[PDB]
Amino acid sequence: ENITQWNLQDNGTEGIQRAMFQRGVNRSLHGIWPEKICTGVPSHLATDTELKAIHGMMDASEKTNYTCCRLQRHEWNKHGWCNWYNIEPWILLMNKTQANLTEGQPLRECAVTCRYDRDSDLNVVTQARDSPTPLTGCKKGKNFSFAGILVQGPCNFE
Numbered sequence: 001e002n003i004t005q006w007n008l009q010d011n012g013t014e015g016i017q018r019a020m021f022q023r024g025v026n027r028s029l030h031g032i033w034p035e036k037i038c039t040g041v042p043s044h045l046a047t048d049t050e051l052k053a054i055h056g057m058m059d060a061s062e063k064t065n066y067t068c069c070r071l072q073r074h075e076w077n078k079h080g081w082c083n084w085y086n087i088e089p090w091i092l093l094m095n096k097t098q099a100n101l102t103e104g105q106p107l108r109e110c111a112v113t114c115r116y117d118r119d120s121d122l123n124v125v126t127q128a129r130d131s132p133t134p135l136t137g138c139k140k141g142k143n144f145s146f147a148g149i150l151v152q153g154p155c156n157f158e
């Protein structure tokens with residue numbers, strides 16, 4: 001079982017969260033994490049042409065104006081190659097996961113990190129996953145905002 005984490009838009013968070021806001025993106029895939037973290041030399045070096053096939057995944061780096069392919073390459077190198085063995089299945093899963101994220105809130109969306117906003121008395125979700133996890137930056141007893149969708153608890157089922 002693989003952790004599936006993604007970023008959520010927020011004008012209040014600098015970096016990708018703000019870029020996503022400006023571009024009308026709500027969810028941008030961060031990664032699919034099996035337990036094993038790749039160490040050592042990748043079996044194949046990912047090209048920009050391969051990495052751009054993950055449509056909708058925005059890079060976390062300003063050095064590419066939040067496009068491709070620093071984050072994508074990093075994901076292949078650190079979590080990809082040693083687990084999927086070939087770039088093809090990995091791009092297919094990554095692309096299809098990002099498609100489901102673009103087509104609204106998934107099956108299980110659980111907050112990972114928040115930015116508590118005093119003006120709206122809300123825990124704005126900056127990163128979510130498909131499994132519950134101890135939170136960070138989330139004020140106790142306050143409601144959650146997953147790219148505008150308001151939820152009672154830390155885990156959103158739509």
Ligand SMILES: *[C@@H]1O[C@H](CO)[C@@H](O[C@@H]2O[C@H](CO)[C@@H](O[C@@H]3O[C@H](CO[C@H]4O[C@H](CO)[C@@H](O[C@@H]5O[C@H](CO)[C@@H](O)[C@H](O)[C@@H]5O)[C@H](O)[C@@H]4O)[C@@H](O)[C@H](O[C@@H]4O[C@H](CO[C@H]5O[C@H](CO)[C@@H](O)[C@H](O)[C@@H]5O)[C@@H](O)[C@H](O)[C@@H]4O)[C@@H]3O)[C@H](O)[C@H]2NC(C)=O)[C@H](O)[C@H]1NC(C)=O
Nearest residue numbers: 001002032033034035036083084085086087088089090093
């Ligand atoms: C969660 O995360 C997991 C990773 O940690 C994901 O699992 C991986 O899934 C990918 C597919 O999405 C698998 O990738 C393929 O791997 C085979 C080789 O696998 C063989 O060896 C590994 C170990 O070395 C074993 O894998 C697993 O074993 C456990 C045992 O209990 C079981 O769970 C499964 O059996 C599982 O597979 C196992 O021994 C396995 O047999 C590659 O061959 C794949 O590449 C394909 O083959 C092409 C090369 O030649 C091919 O040419 C023709 C086409 O002309 C093909 O039809 C033939 O197959 C022929 O071989 C490639 O060029 C081409 O890209 C093609 O796709 C592919 O790399 C990977 O094994 C899984 N890894 C693990 C560790 O399980 C899991 O999907 C994730 N799940 C979710 C829900 O997110």
Ligand SMILES: *[C@@H]1O[C@H](CO)[C@@H](O[C@@H]2O[C@H](CO)[C@@H](O)[C@H](O)[C@H]2NC(C)=O)[C@H](O)[C@H]1NC(C)=O
Nearest residue numbers: 052053054055056091092095096098099100102
């Ligand atoms: C990646 O996912 C996209 C969807 O985000 C797939 O795009 C579809 O491609 C077919 C065939 O060209 C079109 O008929 C659909 O209209 C496309 N869908 C959308 C929503 O644009 C794409 O095929 C996927 N595969 C790869 C390898 O990138």
Ligand SMILES: *[C@@H]1O[C@H](CO)[C@@H](O[C@@H]2O[C@H](CO)[C@@H](O)[C@H](O)[C@H]2NC(C)=O)[C@H](O)[C@H]1NC(C)=O
Nearest residue numbers: 009023024025026027102103104146147148149
């Ligand atoms: C991002 O999420 C919002 C909802 O949180 C999407 O929809 C908004 O509301 C109506 C539908 O109820 C849409 O037609 C508007 O475009 C959205 N308005 C605002 C101000 O966000 C929105 O469409 C999603 N973005 C994408 C790319 O699908």
Ligand SMILES: *[C@@H]1O[C@H](CO)[C@@H](O)[C@H](O)[C@H]1NC(C)=O
Nearest residue numbers: 010011012013014018021022
């Ligand atoms: C987005 O943030 C910038 C910088 O804090 C601010 O100037 C702008 O008014 C913000 N827009 C909204 C809609 O909050």
Ligand SMILES: *[C@@H]1O[C@H](CO)[C@@H](O)[C@H](O)[C@H]1NC(C)=O
Nearest residue numbers: 092093094096097098100107
């Ligand atoms: C995408 O959505 C469908 C329907 O919710 C689901 O069955 C499928 O497993 C999802 N695909 C991925 C790659 O998460």
Ligand SMILES: [Zn+2]
Nearest residue numbers: 001003034035
């Ligand atoms: Zn674990």
Ligand SMILES: [Zn+2]
Nearest residue numbers: 031075078079
């Ligand atoms: Zn990583």
